[PDB]
Design a protein around this nucleic acid. Structure first.
Lengths: 134, 142
RNA sequence: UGGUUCUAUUUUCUAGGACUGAUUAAUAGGGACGGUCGGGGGCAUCAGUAUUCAAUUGUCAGAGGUGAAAUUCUUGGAUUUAUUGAAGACUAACUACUGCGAAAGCAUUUGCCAAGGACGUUUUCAUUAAUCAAGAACGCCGACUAGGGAUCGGGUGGUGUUUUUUUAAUGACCCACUCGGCACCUUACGAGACUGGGGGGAGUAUGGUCGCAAGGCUGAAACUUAAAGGAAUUG
């Protein structure tokens, strides 16, 4: 295990060089989401190019709440969606060539990780119960 | 063309990497040649760490530029032009100059050249490689 | 998206009504991104020289092998030499108290396929977490302080040398810091409470029990018995 994460500043204010509007950021957010990017991609594009540090600080609330209150909710949370599509990519690799025992092992690991947070999201009922991973 | 075994055994030392490449190239004639290459990773002067290994992506990039520029030195040569090119060891200087952007690389050599197929005979081309000649010889004296 | 009517100049601007309402952001965990990293895996491709076999020469009497020999091959030419082909493996030196993998393990090139880790991150979710009976896949100690040198992967900064230029980006080394690894050398401080088993080590004695073992020239005993052999033998 390694310690490599991001270090959120002690400040909770806009950084006083951020001369943009607190609403034009939201309009850019919903524009990028409607052209089709995941919320982590919205956050990293907004951070890199239109220099909002983080939008829970600069806007009102966090950007998945912004997308759900502006009508662009996800069908399934981003974590579960990315783990689902990684699992189905490994499954198509396994149907293609069937002597990859290591990739079978990594499929068992990815499927366990699917079930863990699918169980969490189900008891929170973000997604409905009787959800199965096909 | 071939090295003696003692030369490359005299070149191989531990605590470096040998990048070796080979390409099967057809010349401006229809000779096709498998031509090899060896190169050993140098250490710079002021280097204090004892290793000087390449990071294997530097090996892939060095081997890539070795293959590209020596398949550029062939196809742009005949057999006679390639032989006169590799007598004074100058394809090695081309490899060294083209590769010092990536790693230092002491004693690059070609080490081995194999003919695979040869086109036809062409007695005129051989006699133009050597020199002319034709004989009317002696006559019997009865 | 639909509909009703109110103000001054043939078309200008207007007012109203029906289809959300608690925190962080763990030097906890997950996910995304970025440049990468590795002999991690799978498929395909490429190469290398040995070995074995075969074809063709050249030459002639031996070649293996062993401590010596022998089985074996050999004037229908063995072994040696040269050219070439085929096969099945294997990846030499480089090769390390290095790397990667959950372990068993993994070393030629190139490409494809998915994967993984560390780092960077003012990205995202928000407790989603830790341990293992069962089951499944593959097959001097700890809860503990500091360090030191070296090395592998990433990052930041410095500012010299190799690099170099108006084609793209991209190195290598030196130094300091920092994160994470495989080890090594030390330090300080803690209760740390494929199943079946007699009882120490080295010896000694034996009027017990269970065994195995001596005699005595063979022939040869009911037979003083042949031949031959043995033994000792200066008849």
């Amino acid at each position: 295990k390694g310690i490599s994460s991001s270090a959120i500043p002690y400040s909770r204010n806009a950084p006083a060089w951020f001369k943009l509007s607190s609403e034009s950021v939201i309009e850019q957010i919903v524009k990028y989401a409607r052209k089709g990017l995941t919320p982590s991609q919205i956050g990293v594009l907004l951070r890199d190019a239109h220099g909002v540090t983080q939008a829970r600080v600069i806007t009102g609330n966090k950007i998945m709440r912004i997308l759900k209150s502006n009508g662009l909710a996800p069908e399934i949370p981003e974590d579960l969606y990315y783990l689902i599509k990684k699992a189905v990519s490994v499954r198509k690799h396994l149907e293609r060539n069937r002597k990859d025992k290591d990739a079978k092992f990594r499929l068992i690991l990815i499927e366990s990780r699917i079930h863990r947070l699918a169980r969490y999201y189900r008891t929170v009922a973000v997604l409905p119960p009787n959800w199965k991973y096909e | 063309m071939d090295f003696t075994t003692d030369k490359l055994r005299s070149m191989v030392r531990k605590w470096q990497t040998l990048i070796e490449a080979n390409v099967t190239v057809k010349t401006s004639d229809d000779y096709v040649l498998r031509i090899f290459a060896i190169a050993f990773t140098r250490k710079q002067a002021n280097q204090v760490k004892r290793h000087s290994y390449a990071q294997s992506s530097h090996i892939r990039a060095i081997r890539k530029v070795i293959s590209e520029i020596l398949t550029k030195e062939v196809q742009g040569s005949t057999l006679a032009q390639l032989t006169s090119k590799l007598i004074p060891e100058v394809i090695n200087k081309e490899i060294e100059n083209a590769t010092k952007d990536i790693f230092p690389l002491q004693n690059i050599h070609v080490r081995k050249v194999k003919l695979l197929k040869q086109p036809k005979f062409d007695v005129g081309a051989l006699m133009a490689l050597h020199g002319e000649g034709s004989g009317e010889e002696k006559g019997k004296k009865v």
